[PDB]
From a paper:
Nitric oxide (NO) is an important signaling molecule critical in the cardiovascular, neuronal, and immune systems. The enzyme responsible for generating NO is nitric oxide synthase (NOS), a P450-like heme thiolate enzyme that oxidizes l-arginine to NO and L-citrulline. Humans and other mammals express three different NOS isoforms: endothelial NOS (eNOS), neuronal NOS (nNOS), and inducible NOS (iNOS). nNOS is an important therapeutic target since the overproduction of NO by nNOS in the brain is associated with a number of neurodegenerative diseases. Thus, nNOS is an attractive target for therapeutic intervention. In our efforts to develop inhibitors selective for neuronal nitric oxide synthase (nNOS) over endothelial nitric oxide synthase (eNOS), we found that nNOS can undergo conformational changes in response to inhibitor binding that does not readily occur in eNOS. Here, we used a combination of crystallography, mutagenesis, and computational methods to better understand the structural basis for these differences in NOS inhibitor binding.
We asked the questions, how can the inhibitor displace BH4, and does the inhibitor displacing BH4 in hnNOS bind synergistically or independently from the inhibitor bound in the active site? To explore these questions, we “knocked out” the active site inhibitor binding by mutating the active site Glu to Gln in both hnNOS and heNOS to generate hnNOS E597Q and heNOS E361Q. 4 binds in neither the active site nor the BH4 site in these hnNOS and heNOS mutants. This result indicates that the binding of two inhibitor molecules is synergistic and that one molecule must first bind in the active site before a second molecule binds in the BH4 pocket. In this study, we also found that the binding of a second inhibitor molecule in the BH4 pocket first requires the binding of the inhibitor to the active site.
Author numbering:
A (entry chain B): 68 to 106, 119 to 480
B (entry chain A): 67 to 106, 120 to 480
Write the structure that this text describes.
């Protein structure tokens, strides 16, 4: 049982939950690969049985008649059909637990407050589109964002998967350029190229919202345009740098990850988009300042009249701080939910304490929890963490193309 | 079986083939990653043959006259006496390798330039003091810092060891009060308590340089007042915030780690103080702003008239950047070598590239290479890394009590 120290306070805890880690990660006693971004009815029965056990523990009915009856129903369904169906309440519990178990999520204090939309009866790409529009609308809630997930039908033998080809429901186009550069978000070049290939007439601005490419089973993807009035956006200004508005920068309200696989009790849902609300460093530091994204840092630091010829002036650090101030202020001004990296990491420390009492530990990926500016200024930096895989889970999956 | 390692800024891929040599098994398993934790008789001949082979490979002299001969005498030495003495050049070559293998050192671009002071003929805390005093004055060099390591006698069975009871050669005192809390450095409250207990006059200051506690084999320690003209210190001022100097802050010139255990070819040196020069975040962000260190962050924000009532003003981030600006400006004005975190991480990326060609990879600890401020603004944030233990190495060791 790993002992875990907080260095700011001196406290010490042991992670007993890690002992229950189901799947395996990329590290060995030889070598740690923690910093890497990307690390049969009987085994289906085994995962199912474990999840049903989890479910009946949560409702204080472990070992009950209804518990044994459900184990039997699942075994019989897996024997007759090679798969099984989740009850509605098992689905809700399973989606919340997947969030709870996500080691790279700093927002998990909120895990119990999740709106689960059961789209497991979805029939086509066209119905998928309507469900997704309802998700964006409910989650955005006119700027008072609400956490939600929409669960589309599970993977099942004899039929292809539902897939959302887009990595998030709202993303900006990235157009490869005349002179080899990228106009717009360079992270989205490939999906942008796929949209045009599938009939989209491109724009040529830097913040053009992409269409949705939605795949129903055994069907090519289908293009759907998001209704403009469903996509709430925030123009970026700075509270005291008035030329900052003239950069023409914007970002969208809703972060809705749409390319990850939800696993519950051995069942796999390849289409199950989820959304919370932004932490300011995602927009301010990563999306805008990463050299391979919008890469605005030097341009802002010149406008700030910082001395960009020497690194020891800390011009990068000064420009980045003001970009993050601009993001926070603009979202507050527009009345769109946002959390700064200090508030978020402080709430995550409370989550770690809740989870130590409840489950004896908490899976956490230190390199993802610690914000990408002002790391040691936040309490998570001084907190040792144990990273491991629990199920239910959100997993990465390969791109459909 | 050779980890694929990606840089996400550029898209470039390499394979760490050097990882195949990792000896001292780390703390990670396929079940859980512990990469964020701070602290995780003729076996001597095996690590001797291994290290000697390392020596002769490095000079294009494997499988040649001189190579065999040195294999024999270490075998004879350990047969006749149970251990062996290192050749002068091997001690030099081993010191540089243990540096080059330190996964947590961002400074390793400098690893080939190292001055090795051979103190193996030492005996007693009076001799130690002069050797340490030679090191300090040499390494400081009037502020033109030079990397240096002083190797005190190797450990042998049946007789006590050489140890420096201080974690560094220059540390500041930490004094409790009528209420537990500390004037001075809270990281050194313990050794301050030991020094005062061992016959030292406590100061009344937040920046009193502690005395050395030097221990010869099987004998108690002895206190040694460090020659004040040998302890180069830098008063901290800001280039434009005129009141910053009035805060009365200072830091010392020389970072001289004196509690680690140099291990070469199976031999163990529990007293082998090494020293390089500071990266400015070490002082300005960790030493001054950590909540459990000098904890000055809010005092500086009051002085800057920042709104400390809301976390979303990023008042912590702004105060922190200016504290780091003051450190860099102050050391440069005093003409004491120092490197900012942008220049240091840039040079590390160059080191990674060099080590890729030279040895097929480099052991790096992502959580320690990435600076404690502005992490994703430096190139190392976007570089995946493999951590593993190679020998020769610096290792941690328990306090001598
Ligand atoms: C309520 C507010 C929420 C906040 C503030 C938040 C915060 C974050 C942040 C900052 C990241 C790192 C993302 C990145 O750097 O790309 C992250 C990752 C993640 N979050 Fe949360 N999150 C929230 C809600 C949710 C919800 C509702 C779910 C699912 C039900 C979820 C599941 C995940 C997962 C699976 C990841 C890993 C995704 C990846 O590796 O790219 N989060 N979260
Ligand atoms: C010359 C310029 C150097 C720079 C700029 C530099 C920078 C750093 C930094 C910032 C750390 C992190 C330590 C911490 O956060 O407490 C570190 C760790 C370390 N360095 Fe270097 N260093 C230098 C020279 C050296 C030398 C000369 C040696 C040994 C010969 C060395 C070996 C190590 C070791 C063993 C650690 C790990 C210390 C620990 O875990 O407590 N470095 N270095
Ligand atoms: C190489 C490194 O793993 C990579 O840059 C990671 C580091 N930490 C991160 N942390 C978060 N929250 N999001 C990220 O995309 C990353 N990227
Ligand atoms: C908990 C965590 O491992 C701890 O705070 C580490 C993180 N990374 C670090 N990195 C460096 N260079 N120095 C440190 O002291 C630490 N502290
Ligand atoms: Cl995003
Ligand atoms: Cl230090
Ligand atoms: Gd202004
Ligand atoms: Gd411009
Ligand atoms: Gd004033
Ligand atoms: Zn690991």
């Amino acid at each position: 049982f790993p002992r875990v120290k907080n260095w700011e306070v001196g406290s010490i805890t042991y992670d007993t939950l890690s002992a229950q880690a189901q799947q395996d990660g990329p590290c060995t006693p030889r070598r740690c690969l923690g910093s890497l971004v990307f690390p049969a009815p009987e085994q289906l029965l085994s995962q199912a049985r474990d999840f049903i056990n989890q479910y009946y523990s949560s409702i204080k009915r472990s070992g009950s008649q209804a518990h044994e009856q459900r184990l039997q129903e699942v075994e019989a369904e897996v024997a007759a059909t090679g798969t099984y169906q989740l009850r509605e309440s098992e689905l809700v519990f399973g989606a919340k637990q997947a969030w709870r178990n996500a080691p790279r999520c700093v927002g998990r204090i909120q895990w119990g407050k999740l709106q689960v939309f059961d789209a497991r009866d979805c029939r086509s790409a066209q119905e998928m589109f309507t469900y997704i529009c309802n998700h964006i609308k409910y989650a955005t809630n006119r700027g008072n964002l609400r956490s939600a997930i929409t669960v589309f039908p599970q993977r099942c033998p004899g039929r292809g998967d539902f897939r959302i080809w887009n990595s998030q429901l709202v993303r900006y186009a990235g157009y490869r350029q005349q002179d080899g550069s990228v106009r717009g978000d360079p992270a989205n070049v490939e999906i942008t190229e796929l949209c045009i290939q599938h009939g989209w007439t491109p724009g040529n601005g830097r913040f053009d919202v992409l269409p949705l490419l939605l795949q129903a089973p055994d069907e090519p993807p289908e293009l759907f345009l998001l209704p403009p009035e469903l996509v709430l956006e925030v123009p970026l200004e700075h509270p005291t740098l008035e030329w900052f508005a003239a950069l023409g920068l914007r970002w969208y309200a809703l972060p809705a990850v749409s390319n990850m696989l939800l696993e519950i009790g051995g069942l796999e849902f390849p289409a199950a988009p989820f959304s919370g609300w932004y932490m300011s460093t995602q927009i301010g530091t990563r999306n805008l300042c990463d050299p391979h994204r919008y890469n605005i840092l030097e341009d802002v630091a010149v406008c700030m009249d910082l001395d960009t010829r020497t690194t020891s002036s800390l011009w990068k650090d000064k420009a980045a701080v003001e970009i993050n101030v601009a993001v926070l202020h603009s979202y507050q001004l527009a009345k769109v939910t946002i959390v700064d990296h200090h508030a978020a990491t402080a709430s995550f420390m409370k989550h770690l304490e809740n989870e130590q009492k409840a489950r004896g530990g908490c899976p956490a990926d230190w390199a993802w929890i610690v914000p990408p500016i002002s790391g040691s200024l936040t309490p998570v930096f001084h907190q040792e963490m144990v990273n491991y895989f629990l199920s239910p889970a959100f997993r990465y999956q390969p791109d459909p193309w």
